[PDB]
Every structure is written in structure tokens, then in C-alpha cells.
């Protein structure tokens, strides 16, 4: 016997007490150890409505990750609201770790186990758990990295696909690796490598899903129409360095109408001057460290926006987007909601 409810959650993790790595340090003081034998009870003949777009767990994780970044990735200079802040800006060890979100006494988390669940509506296979799965708090745009995969078909998530102002989340069912590197000795020059055969196969499957939602209209991908570099480029943080990558080459319509099924290499740049995703101001960091900077990640999702208009063409156009970091958390927490016992 329960009802939907909000409360302050706590976090659990496997952070290492001997690590200097920044996610570990934060978690050692802010989270508790995980349960090696977590209990999960499946509820027979039970149906629940979920709404991933209104799930306060999302709001709480955002607050947490902001706090983490505010304490850690402090810049040499911070320009916010007209003031200038100068402080020490040492190089750090940076590599996200999985974080579990857990309910306090008197509360529990319901989990939707429907394989093709889109994030909103009734769920027939519901279980109760104390903690979510382990989520790495990866901040990125355009492409979702190192996340969890869909268990069956690719899933399109939107509060309302017909409403062009709502961001679309594409949940992939098969991972595509992205290999970004700054070769040892222009210190800001980098590049990301993507399997063109795997990627072009997978993106098309996404297109077939979009056709299912848009009355079999033609699906076209296009580059972003504008905005800050953090949104128009695939931005993320690798080993403490802020990478900005051009994804123009990723969404090329031509190769699936040849000679494309090869390796795709995107040009990237490490930036010292960044627009903080925290929404405050501009931040200045020190030049990149020396040597080979390499991060290999799984692409597990895509963030899209569909073009608005008074149109009635035979095409629907989608462009990579994001910038609302809440969407990143939404993509992982979509199957969970908090309820109050008694």
C-alpha cells in the first residue's frame, strides 16, 4: 500500500578511500558503501504509471553533480554575474564512477521492468528496490556516453514527439565505441574515431523507429542550426580536459541510400575557455597536460531536436542537441520512481 512521493535520497558507491580521483573523493564523504546482496521483490499482477519527465530523482541528481563540479573542477578564473574569481587550478585525476540512488526508511523505489517501456505510461512488470543501478554522472552533449543500453529494440523517448520544443532521447540497443585521443606532441589538437559500419547501421535502425512515429515520413539528420559551442559540438570532459568535437560527419544521409563503411574520424579541440553547464558564467583552465590523452567510451544514446514549422513536406529533420544536463540523468532514471510506504 503506497503513493507517489518525494524525499531526500542518499547515495551509495564503491569509491576507493586511497584514490585521489575526484569522483572517488566526493563519494567517500557523500555516499555510503553499497549492499553486496541487495533485495528486489517483483510484484505479481501489478500495473504502475511512470513519468520520466516528472521524476524528482532527476532534479536531485542534478543538484548532486553540480555540487561535485563546484567543489572539484575549480578553474584558474571564474567569470560569473559580473565578478572575477581567481584561484588555484591544479591538474586533477578525473574519471566518473557509478553512483546508486537510494531511499530512506519508510520509502521505496519502484522499477519498471517492461523491456520496451518508453518512460511514460503503465508498466506491467514492477519491482521494488532500495537502490537504483550504478549510474556514472557523465556530463556530455549530443551523444550519451558510458550509459546503459536498451534491452530489446531501440527506444525513442519524448514527453511529446509532436511538440517540437521537447528534447528527444534516443536509447540505443547496441553500443558504438568512440575513441578520442590527443597524440603525444599543437597541444589542443585531438580527434575521435568511430566505426562507420557499426554506426551507420545503428543510426538507420533509429531512423526506422522514427518512421514508425512519424507516419513513415522521410527521416533526415542535419547539423545544429546554432548556439554555444558546448551544444553545437559534442562536448564532454576527458581526464579533466574539456573536449569539443565536430559531429557533422556522424549524421551523413548519403551512405545509406557508398564507400562509407569505413572508419570515421572527427576533428576535436581541447578548450581552456568554457561555458559552465552549471549555467553561471565562463571558466578558465590551465593548458592541457602533456602526453597521450585517451578516453574510450560507449555511445549509448543520442539527443535530438526535430525542426519546427508550418510545413507539410515529406521529410522530418532531426538535429543533435542537448544542453539541458537533466536529460542525461533522465535517460538513466526513467524506469524508477519513489513512493511512500504508509
Amino acid at each position: 500500500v503506497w503513493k507517489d512521493a518525494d524525499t531526500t535520497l542518499f547515495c551509495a558507491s564503491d569509491a576507493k578511500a586511497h584514490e585521489t580521483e575526484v569522483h572517488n573523493v566526493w563519494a567517500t564523504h557523500a555516499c555510503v558503501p553499497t549492499d553486496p546482496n541487495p533485495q528486489e521483490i517483483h510484484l505479481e499482477n501489478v500495473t504502475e504509471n511512470f513519468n520520466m519527465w516528472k521524476n524528482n530523482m532527476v532534479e536531485q541528481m542534478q543538484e548532486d553533480v553540480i555540487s561535485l563540479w563546484d567543489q572539484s573542477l575549480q578553474p584558474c578564473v571564474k567569470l560569473t554575474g559580473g565578478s572575477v574569481i581567481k584561484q588555484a587550478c591544479p591538474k586533477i585525476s578525473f574519471d566518473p564512477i557509478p553512483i546508486h540512488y537510494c531511499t530512506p526508511a519508510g520509502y521505496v523505489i519502484l522499477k519498471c521492468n517492461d523491456k520496451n517501456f518508453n518512460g511514460t505510461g503503465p508498466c506491467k512488470n514492477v519491482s521494488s528496490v532500495q537502490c537504483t543501478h550504478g549510474i556514472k554522472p557523465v556530463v556530455s552533449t549530443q551523444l550519451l556516453l558510458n550509459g546503459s543500453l536498451a534491452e530489446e529494440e531501440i527506444i525513442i523517448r519524448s514527453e511529446n514527439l509532436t511538440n517540437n520544443a521537447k528534447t528527444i532521447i534516443v536509447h540505443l540497443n547496441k553500443s558504438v565505441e568512440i575513441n578520442c585521443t590527443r597524440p603525444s606532441n599543437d597541444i589542443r589538437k585531438a580527434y575521435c574515431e568511430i566505426n562507420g559500419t557499426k554506426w551507420n547501421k545503428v543510426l538507420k535502425q533509429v531512423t526506422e523507429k522514427l518512421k514508425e512515429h512519424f507516419n513513415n515520413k522521410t527521416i533526415i539528420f542535419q547539423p545544429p542550426s546554432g548556439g554555444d559551442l558546448e551544444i553545437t559540438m559534442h562536448h564532454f570532459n576527458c581526464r579533466g580536459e574539456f573536449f569539443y568535437c565536430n559531429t557533422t560527419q556522424l549524421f551523413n544521409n548519403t551512405c545509406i541510400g557508398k564507400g562509407c563503411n569505413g572508419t570515421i574520424t572527427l576533428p576535436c579541440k581541447i578548450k581552456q575557455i568554457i561555458n559552465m553547464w552549471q549555467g553561471t558564467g565562463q571558466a578558465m583552465y590551465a593548458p592541457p597536460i602533456d602526453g597521450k590523452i585517451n578516453c574510450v567510451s560507449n555511445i549509448t544514446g543520442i539527443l535530438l531536436t526535430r525542426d519546427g514549422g508550418a510545413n507539410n513536406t515529406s521529410n522530418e529533420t532531426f538535429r543533435p542537441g542537448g544542453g539541458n544536463i537533466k536529460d542525461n540523468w533522465r535517460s538513466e532514471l526513467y524506469k524508477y520512481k519513489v513512493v511512500q510506504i504508509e
Partner: antibody
Amino acid sequence: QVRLVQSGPQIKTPGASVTISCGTSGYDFMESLINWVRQDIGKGPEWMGWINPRGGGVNYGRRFQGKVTMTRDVSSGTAYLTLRGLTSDDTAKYYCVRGKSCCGGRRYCNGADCFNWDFEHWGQGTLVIVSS
Amino acid sequence: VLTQSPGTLSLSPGETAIISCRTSQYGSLAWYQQRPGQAPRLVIYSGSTRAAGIPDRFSGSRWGPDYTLTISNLESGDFGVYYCQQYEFFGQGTKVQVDI
């Protein structure tokens, strides 16, 4: 007190460029998407596009693709619209609009989280004439 | 996607003006009011919900695809052109004409 104050009217030569402003005050400029609408008397209102004050994300209508760019100044809390390669067809009045708010005092809000289309707040508009 | 009708209503104070608007799609609808030379003013939003500061004389209703806005006891303050709106789509407009 949620006021939208647009810049004054202006005439331009066929081919020039217009940059009209949209002054905002009385609300956190970063929590609401800002739309742009075009009204030519003789016809009805036409939505041109919205921009997210947060990241700068824009959604241009296919009919206005390449003739329209939407920017912003997070400092002054001001939205902007610049028109490229003016023709006699661009002779119209241009509004900057936003919908009803849904944040309700939350600390971290994004304009893409609200509905946006319930246009309650309009500017006074700005006349742009493209004639020789 | 949107078809508003009629184009012009020549009515008088006291009478009840009826403005219809058929949609190919469906969902949330708003009704706007444009006094000559002035910016449009939100009157009905989300279908039937009356906006703030709107007198009871204005009300929204539906029956199938044909959305309607009925205005009871007209006054000269109700003069102007009205538009229906689904998301970013607007109607052609209904020019309601006040009279003396």
C-alpha cells in the same frame, strides 16, 4: 511584472540586415524559452522559432531557414533576432514571445521543461520595412 | 493542419459570436485576440481554461475536431480579429466586427 520591451521600428534597403532586440525583466531570463513571431497584416501570425537562453539552442522553422539567426546576451537578459538579405517579402512586424511558466520557484529549471506554446507574454512589436 | 471559420462576423453588442476552428491534428488549443494595431492577447489556453483577466463572456468548447469560441454579450472591447493556435501553428483568422 513580466515585461518584454522590443527595439524601435526601422526601414531598410532590399539586401541589408536588421537586428532587433527584445528586452526582458521581472523574471529569471534563463528559465524560459523565447519565441519569435511574424505578423503581416493581411494575413495571420506566424511562428518563426524559439531559442533556449541556457545553451543558445535554436529551432528555426523550415520556412525561415537561413534567413533567420537567434542569439542572446545572458548578462543583460536580452534576446536578439537578425534578418539576412532583406526582400520586400520581409516587410512585416515581428514579435518576441514566451509562454506561461511552470518552474514555480525551483532553483534549477530549463525552458524546455515547460510547455512554451501557451503564449501569454508578447512584446509591443517592431516594424521592419524593406522598400527602396 | 488548421482551418478557422468563418473569416468575418458582422455582429452587434448583445449578440453571441461563434468562431470555429477544425484541426487535422488535435491536442492543446489556445484562442487569441488582436485589437487593431496591438499585440495579440491570450484569452483561452489549453482548450477551455480561461486566461487571467478574461471576463466570463469568453469560453472554449469542443465537439470532435471542431473547436469553438463563443462570446456572450459583445462589446466594442471585443472588436478585432481572433486566431486559434496548435503549438506553433496559427489559424487564418476570424475578423469579428463590432457595430453600433
